[PDB]
Design a protein around this motif. Structure first.
Motif, PDB file in Angstrom:
ATOM      1  N   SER B   3      -0.795  -2.723   4.825  1.00  0.00           N
ATOM      2  CA  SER B   3      -0.456  -1.311   4.767  1.00  0.00           C
ATOM      3  C   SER B   3       0.101  -0.946   3.405  1.00  0.00           C
ATOM      4  CB  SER B   3       0.551  -0.970   5.855  1.00  0.00           C
ATOM      5  OG  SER B   3       1.782  -1.622   5.605  1.00  0.00           O
ATOM      6  N   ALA B   4       0.716  -1.903   2.702  1.00  0.00           N
ATOM      7  CA  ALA B   4       1.225  -1.622   1.367  1.00  0.00           C
ATOM      8  C   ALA B   4       0.077  -1.319   0.420  1.00  0.00           C
ATOM      9  CB  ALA B   4       2.043  -2.801   0.849  1.00  0.00           C
ATOM     10  N   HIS B   5      -1.001  -2.104   0.497  1.00  0.00           N
ATOM     11  CA  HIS B   5      -2.158  -1.857  -0.355  1.00  0.00           C
ATOM     12  C   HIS B   5      -2.818  -0.537   0.008  1.00  0.00           C
ATOM     13  CE1 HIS B   5      -2.694  -6.500  -0.975  1.00  0.00           C
ATOM     14  NE2 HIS B   5      -1.604  -6.025  -1.548  1.00  0.00           N
ATOM     15  N   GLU B   7      -1.477   2.077   1.535  1.00  0.00           N
ATOM     16  CA  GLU B   7      -0.581   3.156   1.164  1.00  0.00           C
ATOM     17  C   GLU B   7      -0.551   3.355  -0.343  1.00  0.00           C
ATOM     18  OE1 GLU B   7       3.253   2.609   2.867  1.00  0.00           O
ATOM     19  OE2 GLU B   7       4.030   4.539   2.164  1.00  0.00           O
ATOM     20  N   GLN B   8      -0.604   2.265  -1.111  1.00  0.00           N
ATOM     21  CA  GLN B   8      -0.593   2.351  -2.566  1.00  0.00           C
ATOM     22  C   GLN B   8      -1.807   3.114  -3.068  1.00  0.00           C
ATOM     23  OE1 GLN B   8       1.878   1.060  -4.655  1.00  0.00           O
ATOM     24  NE2 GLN B   8       0.735   2.100  -6.282  1.00  0.00           N
ATOM     25  N   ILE B   9      -2.981   2.735  -2.569  1.00  0.00           N
ATOM     26  CA  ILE B   9      -4.211   3.394  -2.983  1.00  0.00           C
ATOM     27  C   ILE B   9      -4.201   4.846  -2.531  1.00  0.00           C
ATOM     28  CG2 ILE B   9      -6.711   3.409  -2.771  1.00  0.00           C
ATOM     29  CD1 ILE B   9      -6.392   0.287  -2.222  1.00  0.00           C
ATOM     30  N   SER B  10      -3.664   5.112  -1.339  1.00  0.00           N
ATOM     31  CA  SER B  10      -3.603   6.483  -0.855  1.00  0.00           C
ATOM     32  C   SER B  10      -2.664   7.321  -1.711  1.00  0.00           C
ATOM     33  CB  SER B  10      -3.147   6.496   0.595  1.00  0.00           C
ATOM     34  OG  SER B  10      -1.778   6.154   0.675  1.00  0.00           O
ATOM     35  N   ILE B  11      -1.558   6.720  -2.158  1.00  0.00           N
ATOM     36  CA  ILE B  11      -0.599   7.418  -3.008  1.00  0.00           C
ATOM     37  C   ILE B  11      -1.257   7.800  -4.316  1.00  0.00           C
ATOM     38  CG2 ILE B  11       1.483   7.037  -4.458  1.00  0.00           C
ATOM     39  CD1 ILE B  11       2.409   5.250  -1.921  1.00  0.00           C
ATOM     40  N   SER B  12      -1.968   6.852  -4.921  1.00  0.00           N
ATOM     41  CA  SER B  12      -2.637   7.148  -6.179  1.00  0.00           C
ATOM     42  C   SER B  12      -3.730   8.186  -5.981  1.00  0.00           C
ATOM     43  CB  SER B  12      -3.212   5.877  -6.773  1.00  0.00           C
ATOM     44  OG  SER B  12      -2.189   4.972  -7.140  1.00  0.00           O
TER      45      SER B  12
END
Lengths: 50, 46
Positions: B3-5, B7-12
Motif C-alpha cells: 500500500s505504501a508503493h 499510495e506513493q504513486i497515487s500521491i505523485s
C-alpha cells in the motif's frame, strides 16, 4: 595695445571659423531629415478602444 | 510496503495532474493570430 587687440581678435575669429567649419562638417545633414520628418509629422490619435 | 508503493504513486499522480499548468489564459496568441477589428482583448471563450 593695438597689437594685442589685432592678434587676439584675429585668433578669436579664427577659432570662430573653426567652430562653424566643423559644424558644417557635422550638422549639414540635418535639413534632409528635417524635411523628411516634417513630411512625417501628420499625427492625430483617438483611441477607439479607450 | 504494498500500500505504501500504491499510495506513493497515487500521491505523485495527484500532485502531477493537479498541477495548474498554464492554460490558454493568453492574449498574445489571439492578439496576433486573429487579426480582427480593434477592441481591448476578446479571448474567444466560447
Amino acid at each position: 595695445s593695438y597689437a594685442d587687440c589685432v592678434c587676439s581678435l584675429r585668433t578669436s575669429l579664427a577659432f570662430l571659423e573653426s567652430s562653424v567649419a566643423t559644424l558644417d562638417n557635422g550638422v549639414q545633414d540635418f535639413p534632409r531629415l528635417c524635411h523628411v520628418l516634417r513630411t512625417v509629422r501628420h499625427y492625430e490619435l483617438i483611441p477607439q478602444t479607450t | 510496503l504494498l500500500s505504501a508503493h500504491l499510495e506513493q504513486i497515487s500521491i505523485s499522480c495527484q500532485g502531477i495532474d493537479s498541477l495548474p499548468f498554464p492554460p490558454p489564459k493568453i492574449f498574445t496568441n489571439a492578439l496576433l493570430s486573429n487579426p480582427d477589428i480593434t477592441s481591448l482583448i476578446r479571448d474567444t471563450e466560447a
